[PDB]
C-alpha cells in the first residue's frame, strides 16, 4: 500500500467565522478542506472475487 496507492493532502480541515452574511445576532460558520488521491502503479495490488 505504501506504493500501490497514494494519498494527496494539500490543506487540512479548517473552520472560520464567515464574516459577511453574519449579523450582530446570528453567526454563520464555514469549514473546508482540500485533499485527494490516486492510484500508484496498479500492478502492485490484487483483488479476490467469487
Amino acid at each position: 500500500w505504501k506504493t500501490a496507492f497514494y494519498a494527496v493532502e494539500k490543506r487540512p480541515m479548517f473552520f472560520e467565522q464567515y464574516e459577511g452574511g453574519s449579523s450582530a445576532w446570528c453567526v454563520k460558520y464555514q469549514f473546508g478542506a482540500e485533499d485527494g488521491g490516486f492510484v500508484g502503479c496498479c500492478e502492485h495490488g490484487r483483488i479476490l472475487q467469487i
Binding site: 506504493t3 493532502e9 487540512p12 480541515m13 479548517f14 472560520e16 469549514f31
Partner: protein, 381 residues
C-alpha cells in the same frame, strides 16, 4: 517552571489540525529558491551572504549576563565535547560548511533545522543540518511541534522535538531531537505562520530582469550585422551590375584596391549606411535598477557590487540578521544556562581597525575601572 499553556492554541482548534505532518515551506517558495540559485544577481548576493557568515569562528564561553550562579555547564565535559562538535561536526563536514548551509537556508526560506545525537549524558556526538524543503513537522494539541518527519515513504524518522524528549535529571536530553529555528512575522503564529524571506518581495524585478536579458540575448543574434545597403537602378544589365558588386566588394581589408574611391560611370547607384545602434540591447538604465532592488532587498550596499560600506554590511545586516539569531538559537537549546555559544568579533577582518582604535581611546579614559574597559570591547576577564 514550565506551565505548558501557551496562547498558541488559537490555531490547532480550527486554523490547523493535529497529527498531519504539514510541510514547512510552500512548494512555490522552494521552486523560487531553486531558480534563484541559477539567476546571476540572486545567486551572487546569496553566495556572498553565505560566504561571510561562513567565515566567523565559533567557541563556547561564559555568557556575560551570568546571573545564574547555578551554572548550566552541567559536566564541563559536555561543554568540552560541545566545543569539539562546533569545531568538528558529523564526519565528512566541517563547522564552516555547517555555517554556510545554515545561513543559506535561513536566507532562502527563513528557517534553520538541525539534528543531534547526544550519547547518553548530555554529550552531543554530531550535528546534521536538515534539508528544509522536504522536512515536515507535526504539532501537539496545545501549541507546539513535537516531532519532525523527514521523508515521504521510506524515510519515516519521527525525530522528536527538543520540547518532548527523554531529559536527564537536570534537563539535558538523552536521545535525538531537532531545532527548527524560525524567523518571526506578523500576526504571531510562531510556527503556523508564513515564511519571512526577501524572496517574498523580489518576484517582480527578477522577472523583469530575466525578461530584459531574454530580449538582450534574442536581439543579439537575429539583427543583421551588415552595413552599406546598396541598391541598383532598374536598368543595370546583370552581367555588368555584378561588376559593380565586385568593385564595391573588392575594397575590404586585405583587398587589392581597398581604400581607393569607387567610380560609377552613369546609372547612379545609391548606398545608405545602416545605423545598427545595438548599444541599448539590454536596457542598461532599467536593468541596474532591478539589480539594485534585488540587492537592497537582501540588505547589501550597492557599492560592494568603500571600506565604510564593508563595515556597514558587516555590522548592520550580517551581524543582526544571521549571526545573532543563529547564535541565540544554538545558545537556547544546546547547553545549560550561564554558558552559550559565542563567535569572536575580532575574527572578522573588516572590524579589526575599528576595534583597534576603540581599544586605544578607551585606554586614555580614567574614571572607569579596568574590568569594564575590558568587557566593553570583548576580553571577558
Amino acid at each position: 517552571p514550565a506551565p505548558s499553556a501557551n496562547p498558541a492554541k488559537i490555531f490547532i482548534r480550527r486554523f490547523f489540525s493535529a497529527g498531519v505532518a504539514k510541510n514547512v515551506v510552500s512548494y512555490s517558495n522552494v521552486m523560487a529558491a531553486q531558480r534563484a540559485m541559477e539567476h546571476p544577481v540572486a545567486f551572487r548576493c546569496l553566495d556572498k551572504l553565505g560566504l561571510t557568515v561562513q567565515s566567523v569562528k565559533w567557541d563556547v564561553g561564559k555568557d556575560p549576563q551570568n546571573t545564574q550562579v547555578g551554572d548550566g555547564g552541567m559536566s564541563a565535559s559536555q561543554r568540552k565535547a560541545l566545543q569539539q562538535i562546533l569545531q568538528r561536526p558529523n564526519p565528512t563536514m566541517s563547522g564552516a560548511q555547517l555555517r554556510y548551509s545554515a545561513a543559506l537556508s535561513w536566507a532562502c526560506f527563513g528557517r534553520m533545522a538541525f539534528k543531534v545525537s547526544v550519547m547518553s549524558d548530555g554529550s552531543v556526538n554530531a550535528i546534521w543540518p536538515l534539508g528544509i524543503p522536504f522536512l515536515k513537522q507535526k504539532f501537539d494539541r496545545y501549541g507546539d511541534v513535537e516531532s519532525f518527519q523527514y521523508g515521504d515513504e521510506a524515510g519515516k524518522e519521527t525525530i522528536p522535538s527538543f520540547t518532548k524528549v527523554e531529559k536527564n535529571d537536570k534537563g539535558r536530553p538523552i536521545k535525538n531531537y531537532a531545532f527548527m529555528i524560525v524567523k518571526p512575522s506578523i500576526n504571531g503564529a510562531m510556527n503556523f505562520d508564513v515564511q519571512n524571506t526577501p524572496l517574498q518581495a523580489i518576484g517582480v524585478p527578477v522577472a523583469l530582469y530575466d525578461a530584459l536579458m531574454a530580449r538582450a540575448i534574442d536581439s543579439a543574434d537575429g539583427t543583421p550585422n551588415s552595413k552599406w545597403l546598396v541598391t541598383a537602378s532598374r536598368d543595370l544589365d546583370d552581367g555588368q551590375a555584378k561588376e559593380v558588386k565586385e568593385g564595391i566588394e573588392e575594397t575590404k581589408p586585405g583587398g587589392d584596391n581597398g581604400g581607393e574611391i569607387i567610380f560609377i560611370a552613369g546609372t547612379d547607384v545609391k548606398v545608405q549606411e545602416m545605423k545598427n545602434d545595438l548599444s541599448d540591447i539590454h536596457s542598461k538604465v532599467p536593468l541596474d535598477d532591478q539589480a539594485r532592488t534585488i540587492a537592497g532587498n537582501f540588505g547589501i550596499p550597492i557599492a560592494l557590487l568603500y571600506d565604510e560600506s564593508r563595515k556597514a554590511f558587516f555590522e548592520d545586516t550580517i551581524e543582526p540578521g544571521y549571526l545573532t539569531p543563529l547564535e541565540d538559537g544554538f545558545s537556547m537549546f544546546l547547553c545549560g544556562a550561564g554558558y552559550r555559544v559565542i563567535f569572536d568579533r575580532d575574527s572578522i577582518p573588516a572590524l579589526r581597525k575599528s576595534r583597534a582604535d576603540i581599544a586605544a581611546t578607551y585606554d586614555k579614559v580614567t574614571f572607569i575601572t579596568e574590568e569594564e574597559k575590558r568587557e566593553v570591547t570583548g576580553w571577558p576577564a
